[PDB]
Amino acid sequence: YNAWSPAQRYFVEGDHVVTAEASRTFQFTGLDSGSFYPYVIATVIATAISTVFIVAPLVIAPSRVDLDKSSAYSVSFYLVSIMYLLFDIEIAYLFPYAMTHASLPMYWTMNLFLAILVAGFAYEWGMGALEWRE
Amino acid sequence: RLQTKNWSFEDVHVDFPKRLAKLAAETGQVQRLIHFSDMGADENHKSLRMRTKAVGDKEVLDAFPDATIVRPGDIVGIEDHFYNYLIYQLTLTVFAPVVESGSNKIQPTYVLDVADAVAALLRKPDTAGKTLYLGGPEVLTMREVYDLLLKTLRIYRDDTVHLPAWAVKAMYKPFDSVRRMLPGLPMTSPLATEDYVEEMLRDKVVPAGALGYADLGIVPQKVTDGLAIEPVRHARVGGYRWGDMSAVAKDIPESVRKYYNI
Amino acid sequence: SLSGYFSRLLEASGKKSVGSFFASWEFGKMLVDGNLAHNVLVRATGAGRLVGTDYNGNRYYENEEAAYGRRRWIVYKDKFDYNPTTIPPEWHGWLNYINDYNPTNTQFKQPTYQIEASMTKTGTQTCYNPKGSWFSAKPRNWRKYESWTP
Amino acid sequence: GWNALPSLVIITGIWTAGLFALDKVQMFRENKPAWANNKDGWQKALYRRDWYLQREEETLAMAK
Amino acid sequence: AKGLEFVVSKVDNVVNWARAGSIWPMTFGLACCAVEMMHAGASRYDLDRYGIIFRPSPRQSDAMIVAGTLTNKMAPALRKVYDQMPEPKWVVSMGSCANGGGYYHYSYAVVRGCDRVVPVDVYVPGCPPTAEGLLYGLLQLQKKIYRSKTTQIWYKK
Amino acid sequence: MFFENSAILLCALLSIAVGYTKSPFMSLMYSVMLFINSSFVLMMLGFEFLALVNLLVYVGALAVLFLFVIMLLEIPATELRAYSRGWSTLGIFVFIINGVFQITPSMGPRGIITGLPGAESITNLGHALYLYFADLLILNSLVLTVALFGRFAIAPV
Amino acid sequence: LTPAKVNNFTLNFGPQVLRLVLEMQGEIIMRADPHIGLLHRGTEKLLEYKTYLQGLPYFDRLDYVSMMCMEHSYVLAIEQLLNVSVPLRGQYIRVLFSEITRVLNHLLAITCHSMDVGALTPFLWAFEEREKLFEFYERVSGARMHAAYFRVGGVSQDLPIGLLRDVYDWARQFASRLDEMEELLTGNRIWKERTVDVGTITAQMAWDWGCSGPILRASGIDWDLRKTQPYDAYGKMQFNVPIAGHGDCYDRYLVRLQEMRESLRIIYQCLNEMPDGLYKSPDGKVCPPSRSTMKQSMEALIHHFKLYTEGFHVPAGETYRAVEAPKGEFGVYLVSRGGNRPYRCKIRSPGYAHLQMTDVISRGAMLADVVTIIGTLDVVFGEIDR
Amino acid sequence: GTERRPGESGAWKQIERQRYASDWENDPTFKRTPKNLAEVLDDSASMLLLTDVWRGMAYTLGAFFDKKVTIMYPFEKGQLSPRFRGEHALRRYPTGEERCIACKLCEAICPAQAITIEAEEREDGSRRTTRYDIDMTKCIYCGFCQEACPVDAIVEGPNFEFSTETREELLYDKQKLLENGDKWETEIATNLRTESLYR
Amino acid sequence: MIVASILILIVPVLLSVAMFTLAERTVMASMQRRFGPQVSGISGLLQPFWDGLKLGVKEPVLPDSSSAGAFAASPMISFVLSQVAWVGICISDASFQGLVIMAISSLAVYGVMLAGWASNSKYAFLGCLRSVALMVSYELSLGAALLSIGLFVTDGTGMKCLNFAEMPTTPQYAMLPLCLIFLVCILAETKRDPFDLPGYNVEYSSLGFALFFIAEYANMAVMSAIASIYFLGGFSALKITALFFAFVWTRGTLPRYRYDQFMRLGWKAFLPLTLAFFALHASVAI
Ligand code: SF4
Ligand code: SF4
Ligand code: SF4
C-alpha cells in the first residue's frame, strides 16, 4: 500500500516523500506495524520450493512404462466433526473474554455461557454419544 | 533421430554399419546379417536421417550381398517413439502443431509382428540379400490418426493446428541450429525437427510390389485396436470415470443410461 | 596422551608424518567413509596391541580388556578398496574367533600346492566361468558321442 | 550415547547460528531490538507520525 | 573440455556416493531367509548403520532382496511389486530358494530361482546365508554401484 | 494497490467458479481458497481477530465436514448428466442482470464510497459482547445447543 | 447357485505373505476370509521321493522359528515304528535344546507382536539373546537355524566341551533380560488397552477350534503334553504350568512369559543333571557308526555304505506322534509300506488350526486389532502352508 | 502391574458389561476399590501424572547411557565354530593327489540333487572323477555330503563370503572346487584336528 | 531483505530436521543397545543428506486413475504451511500470534485428507480420516490450553495480547497439569506414539515423501517452540533439543493406542480438564 492523501501523510507536502513511500523498505517499526505481510512472501517462496522439488525427480530419474506400476498397492466421523465445529465456535466466542480485563458480572455471564455449553456436552456424554464403538 | 555434437547422422547410419558389414564378411562364419532402416528412407529425400539411412542400406548391400534389409514404418508399443511423443504433444502442451493439411499416408505396425518377422526371416532362406518392408493392414493419414487418438484419450478439445511447413521450420529453426555443440538434452521430442516436417510432406507406406508380411506368411494384427491399444488406453486406464465425456454413452451400461435418460 | 595417540595413528595409518597423513587422499576418503574413518581414528587408537602382519600388509590387533565378540580387529592396507577376501586363512580362524591360533604363535603346515589369498574378481569379466560359458577360452560341446564327418 | 552426541551438539549449534544470524539481520533491518513488541493503534500512530516526521526532516534537509 | 570432463567424473562420483549409501529395500517376509534378514538389521549387525531403511512401499524402495522361496502363485505378485519399483532399481538374490530352487527345485509349484521372473544384480548364497554374508553381499552391491558412470555416458552420447 | 485490488476481484471470480465446476472436490477447494482470500482482504480492513476466527471456523471445521460428507456420499456422477444435461439459461441470465450490471445495488442511489482501514479492538469487542449484547450471547449459546441437540437427535442409525 | 449383485463394500488386505479379505459394515469387522497357499511348497509329496534321512532337512524349514521341535516329532515317529530306545544323555540334550528353541520362539513371537503393536525396543533387545542362542546352535551343529541335529536314535554329534559353561552364563542373566523386557509393556496402560479383552476365546470353542500351546493354557485349561504324554526326559523334569482364565491377548502374553520362565527352570535342571554316556543308539544297522569305527572295521564300513545310500527299511505300519511345540502341538502322521522311503507323511501344524479362528474371533473387532489377532496367534506360514 | 481396571479393557462388550455389571469386582485379578482418601489419592496418582510410562522411560534412558554390542564389519567379525558348514570344497592328500575317489556316496546321499558326477579310470589305473560339479544355487549346505564321505574329500569350508554378481559364477565345477580346497586347506585341516575328537 | 530473512530462517529448519531424524534414529539405537547410523559419513554425520539426495534422484510415479494435481500439491501444501508457521514463529508481530499459529496448524489436516482422497487406496481412505479426526479432536484442547495461557499474557502498555516477545521470561509453575496435557496434545498432533496408529502417504514417493517428512518434523519443531515459549519461559535452542530428546524418549518406550481409545481419551479426559482449568484460571485472574 501507498498513501494517496496528504492527510494520510500527516499533511507533509513534497514529492520526495511520495517516492520514498513508493520504494520504501518494509519495517514493522516503519509504516506497517502488524502488517502480516511476510506471510504472503513466505507463501510465494514455499510454493516455489515445493514446485521445484516436485519437478526435479522428473528430470534426474530414469523412466519406464508399466501397466501395473500405475496401480495402488462412518458416523463417528460425523459426530466428531460436527462437535468440533460447535466447540470451536464456542472457543472463538470465549477468546475475546480472555483478552480483556473483564468485570464480575462479565465473569458471571461467561460462566453462564460455559454452563449452557457443558450442559449440552454432558447430555451428549450421558446418552452414549461419546462412546465411539461406531 | 536427432543429431548430436558427439555423433552425427552419417556416423551412426553410414560408417558404422559399413565397417560392421566389412568385419562380418571378414569373419566368414556369419550366415545372416540383419539390418534395419525406415520405410521413409530414400536417397532423394530432403530429410538428412532418411538419406543417411538409404545410403547406409546401399553400403551394407554392396559390402554384404546376402544381408537382409528390413524397412518397417511406424512401430507401436508401450515405450515406442511414435505414440508416446504424440501423447506428450497432445497433453502437457498448450497447442499441437500439424504440418500443412497433414493428409500424408502412413502404415503403422506393431512390434511383436516385427519380432515374429525376424524369426520368419531367419527361417526363410530366400529373404537373404533382399529388402522387406513392414506395414499394417490399413492406410491412414496423420489427421485420421490424431482424431482416433483424441477419441482414445476422449479429449473434448482439439488442440491441434494445421500450419504451413515454413512456419513449423521457423518454430524449430532456433533449436536445430544449436543442436550441435551440445551433449544432448532430455525430454526432447524427435518431432521438433525440419526432417520431421519433410517426412510429413510425403506419404510413408509400403511400396507397391514390395516384400512384406504376406511374404512371411504373417498376418499383421490390428494396430488401431486390440491388445496393442490397451497400453495407450492405460493413459485413460481404459476408462472408468475419467473425463467429462458424454459421447462415450455408447459403451455405458444399460441402467445408467436410463438413469441419465438418453 | 596426545603424543601416544599420534604415534599410534602414524603406526596404524602407515604414513610417516601427521602432515603426510592429513594431506593424503586416504584421509580425504576417510572424510566420506565413516566405517573406514572409525577404524583409523577410534578402534585402532584405543588401548590394545598389535598382533602381526600378513603378506598383504594388513595389521592385526587384539584387546583383552574389551568385551567378548569385540576383542580382535584388523586394518586393511588397501585403504580405497578394502575387502575381507584378502585376509589369509591362517588369520581367518583367529579373526573369526574359531581358534586361538595365529602365525605369530602357531606354526602351521604349508602344502606345496597352497594358493595364496587375494581380492575377489566377482563382477569382472576375468572371473571364473563354467566350461560351457561364452567367456570360456574354447567352447565345449558336451555331446557324449562323436559325429561322423565325410 | 556417544554416537548420537555429535548430532545432539550439531542441532543446538545449528539453531544457535540460525537464531544469531536472524537476530543480526533483523536488527540491521529494523534498527531497534524491540520490533517484536505488541503495538496498538496508539503506538502505530506514534511510529507512523515519527516516520513521516523523519521524511519531512529529510525534505527540509535538502532546502538549505 | 578436459575440465568439463573432470567435472562430469566428479559428479558421477558424488552420484554413486549418494545412491550407494542410501539404499532402501522393501520387505518380502517370504520364508527362512527373512529371519536372517531381520537379524541383519538388529543391534549386532545394524543394517541401519549402512544407510539401509526398510520402506512399506515400493515407491520409496531402492532395491529388492528376495528372502525366501517363491511360488508360482506368488510370482505374479512379486512381479507386481517389482514393477512398482521406481528407477534406478536393483535386485538382490539371497538364499538358494531364491537362487535356483534349491531344496524345492523339483517341486511343481516352485519358481526355480527368482531370476526366471525378474532380473537380479546380487546373488547371495546360503540356506540360509549368514547375516554377515548378507552384509558382504550388500557391500558388493555398493561396489557395483560405485563403478557406475551415468553422466560420463550421457556427456559422450 | 494493484495486488490488493486483484485479490479483492478474485473473491467474486472464485464465487462464480464455485458453482461453475462440476467436480464437488473442485467446488470445495474453490470455496476454501475464497474463504482464505476473503479473510486476507478483510485483514486489510484491520480485523486481525475476526479474520482468524473466520479462517479457523470455516477451514478447520466446516470444509472438513463438507469433504467428508462428499467423500462418504459421492461416487463420481459428473458424466451422470452433470456434463450431458448442462445448465439453465434463465439462471445465468438472471445472475448477469443481478451481479454484472447490478440494476439493484446495495448502495442504490449512491455510486461511490470511500473504503478506509479500521482499528479492531478486542477489548472493545469484549466490552460490547459481554456488556451490550450479552443477551444475544446467551441466545447464541441457545442456538449452539439447538444445533447440537438437533444433530444428535437426527442421527442415522 | 450364487450371483454377485450387491458389490458395495470391497477390501484387499495385503499381498505382502498373508492375503486377507475382510467385510465391514463400517469401522467394525463382520467377516474375515484369509486366503493361503502362497507358501505351499508341496513338501509332503516331495517327501515320498526322499529317504528318511534325506527328508530330515525338510522338517527344518517347516517352522524356521522352532526347528529341533519339528525334528523331534518326526524322529520319534520313525523310532516308535523302528522300536528303538534313546540313550539318556541324548534325551537330556534333546530336552535342553528343545527348551532353548522354545525360548527362541517365544522371544521372536513376543517381539514381533510388540513391533506390530508399536513397541520396537524389546524387538532389538531380545534379538541379542537370540543371537547368543544362535551362536549356541552353531557351536553344536555348524548351522544357525537349520541344524539337522536330531537323528533317529540320538543326535549327530556330542556337545563340544565348554558349551554348558556358556549356557549357564547366559542363564545367569537371561532372567534380568526378561525382567527389563517386561517393564516396557507389563505396567503400561497402553499395552493393556491394546491387548486386554481383544480376541476372547472359550475353552469349549478352543477344544472345538483345536487350539494347542499357550492359547489353550490361557482358557483355564490344565494341559501340557510334557506332563500328560511325556516324551524322553520330560517326565523327570519338575516345572510349573502357567494358567490364565480370560482368553485375552494380554493373558496369552503373560502365559508365554511364564512359559519362558519355566523353560529357564528346565534349562537349569538339565544343566545340573547332564549324564555321561552314549549319545547315539547302539544299533549300527539304523544309526551310523563313528568315522574312526568306519575306517578300521569292515562291518561298520558296510553299514555306512548301505545306510548313506539306501537307508534303513522301516517295517510296514502306521503311527502318528506329536510334540508340545512352542506354537502348539506339532504332529506328523507316518505311513510305512516296508521300504526305505516313507509311503505317506502327513504333517499337522498347530498354527494352521489357530489361523482358522480368524473369522469368528475378528467379528466385532476393529482393523487395529486384526494385526493384534495375527500377532497373538503366533503363526508361521511355513508350517501352515507345507 | 498386571491388575485390571474398569474402562481399561479395549472392547465394548466388556466395557459395557463392567459399567453395567459389577462382575469385575468378583474377579480377584481386578485391583480392589480404594477405601480411604489415601487410596483415592494413590489411584489418582496411578491414572493421572502417568507414573507407569515413567518407569519404562527411565529404564530406556539408562539404556542410553549404557554400553552397546555393535560390531564394525568388515573390520570386525563374529564368533563361529569348526563345525560351521560353508562353501563346499575338494580336498587333496599332502603329496598332492585328490582325496575324492568317485565312490559317489556324496551324490547318492545328497537330497538336493545338486551334485553331478562323471568318472572313469585314469591313465595310471587310478579311479578318479572326470566331472565333479555341485550347484551352490541348489546346494542346501546341509553337510550330509561331509558326513557321508569316508576319505574326507568333500568339505564345507569356513568361507561364507562368496556372493557373486551373476548366478552362473556359482555353478561350481571340479576345477574351482579344487582351487577352493587348495586355498583353504590349512584352516580345514586345523578344524579337522579338533573335529576328529567328535566326528 | 524480507525474502533473505525468510531464507535465513529456512536453512536451519531443513538442516536441523535432517539432523532431528538422524538423531532420533541414533538415540533410538542408543536406547536399543545398538549404535545406529555410523558408517554413512563421520560417525554417520551424513545420512539424511544422502537420503534426501537419493529420494531426489528416485523416480516419481503418478497413478493414471486419479487427479495428480492434488497428489502433487498436498505435500506441497503441507510444506507451505510448515514454512508459513516458521515465518509466523520468527518473522511476525501479530497481536494474536499464538492464535495465528494455532489456525495455521489447523490447516495441515488437509494434506493428509487430500492425499487420502487422491490415491485409490482403501486403507489410505480409512487412515487419512482416522488421523484427521484425531488431530481435529485434539485441536480443541490445544486451543483451550492457549485460552488458559492468554489469561495472563499482558504487555507493559496493559493490553492483553499473544505477542511472543511479551511472554514472561519465567516458567509457569502454576499450570503444570495444563502444560502436561498440552504436551500430550502436541504428541498427538504429530502422529507420534502413543498416537502413531495412522501410512497415509503409502502411495507417495520421492521428494513428495521427503516433503511429507519435512512437514511432519517441522510441525513437531513448531509445536516444540510454541511449548517452550508458553511454559518453559522463553525460546531457545536448548529447550527445542531437550523437548525433542524427551519426545524420542517417549517414542522409544511406549506402544500406540487404539483409534476409538484415544478418541475416548481426548473427548472425555483432556478437553473437559482444559475447560475446567480455563475456568479456574479466569476466575483467579479476576
Ligand atoms: S534358502 Fe533355505 S533358509 Fe533361506 S528361505 Fe530358502 S529354505 Fe529357508
Ligand atoms: S567327494 Fe567323497 S563321497 Fe563324494 S564321490 Fe568323492 S570320495 Fe565319494
Ligand atoms: S552340503 Fe548338503 S546340499 Fe551341499 S553338496 Fe553336501 S549334501 Fe549336497
UniProtKB/Swiss-Prot annotation, chain F:
Keywords: Electron transport, Membrane, Mitochondrion, NAD, Respiratory chain, Translocase, Transmembrane, Transmembrane helix, Transport, Ubiquinone. It is found in: Mitochondrion membrane. InterPro entries: NADH_UbQ/plastoQ_OxRdtase_su6, Nuo/plastoQ_OxRdtase_6_NuoJ. Signal peptide: none annotated. It catalyses: a ubiquinone + NADH + 5 H(+)(in) = a ubiquinol + NAD(+) + 4 H(+)(out). It is a multi-pass membrane protein. GO terms for cellular component: mitochondrial membrane. The chain crosses the membrane at residues 1-21, 32-52, 55-75, 87-107, 129-149. PANTHER family: NADH-UBIQUINONE OXIDOREDUCTASE CHAIN 6. Belongs to the complex I subunit 6 family. Core subunit of the mitochondrial membrane respiratory chain NADH dehydrogenase (Complex I) that is believed to belong to the minimal assembly required for catalysis. Complex I functions in the transfer of electrons from NADH to the respiratory chain. The immediate electron acceptor for the enzyme is believed to be ubiquinone. This is NADH-ubiquinone oxidoreductase chain 6. It comes from Chlamydomonas reinhardtii. The lineage of its organism: Eukaryota, Viridiplantae, Chlorophyta, core chlorophytes, Chlorophyceae.
Curated annotation (Swiss-Prot), chain I:
Pfam families: NADHdh. InterPro entries: NADH_UbQ_OxRdtase_su1/FPO (IPR001694), NADH_UbQ_OxRdtase_su1_CS (IPR018086). It is found in: Mitochondrion inner membrane. It catalyses: a ubiquinone + NADH + 5 H(+)(in) = a ubiquinol + NAD(+) + 4 H(+)(out). Its EC number is 7.1.1.2. PROSITE patterns: COMPLEX1_ND1_1, COMPLEX1_ND1_2. The chain crosses the membrane at residues 2-22, 71-91, 98-118, 132-152, 167-187, 207-227, 229-249, 266-286. Keywords: Electron transport, Membrane, Mitochondrion, Mitochondrion inner membrane, NAD, Respiratory chain, Translocase, Transmembrane, Transmembrane helix, Transport, Ubiquinone. It is an enzyme of class 7 (translocase). It is a multi-pass membrane protein. One of its GO terms (cellular component) is mitochondrial inner membrane. It comes from the Eukaryota. One of its GO terms (molecular function) is NADH dehydrogenase (ubiquinone) activity. Belongs to the complex I subunit 1 family. HAMAP family: NDH1_NuoH (MF_01350). Core subunit of the mitochondrial membrane respiratory chain NADH dehydrogenase (Complex I) that is believed to belong to the minimal assembly required for catalysis. Complex I functions in the transfer of electrons from NADH to the respiratory chain. The immediate electron acceptor for the enzyme is believed to be ubiquinone. PANTHER family: NADH DEHYDROGENASE SUBUNIT 1, NADH-UBIQUINONE OXIDOREDUCTASE CHAIN 1. This is NADH-ubiquinone oxidoreductase chain 1.
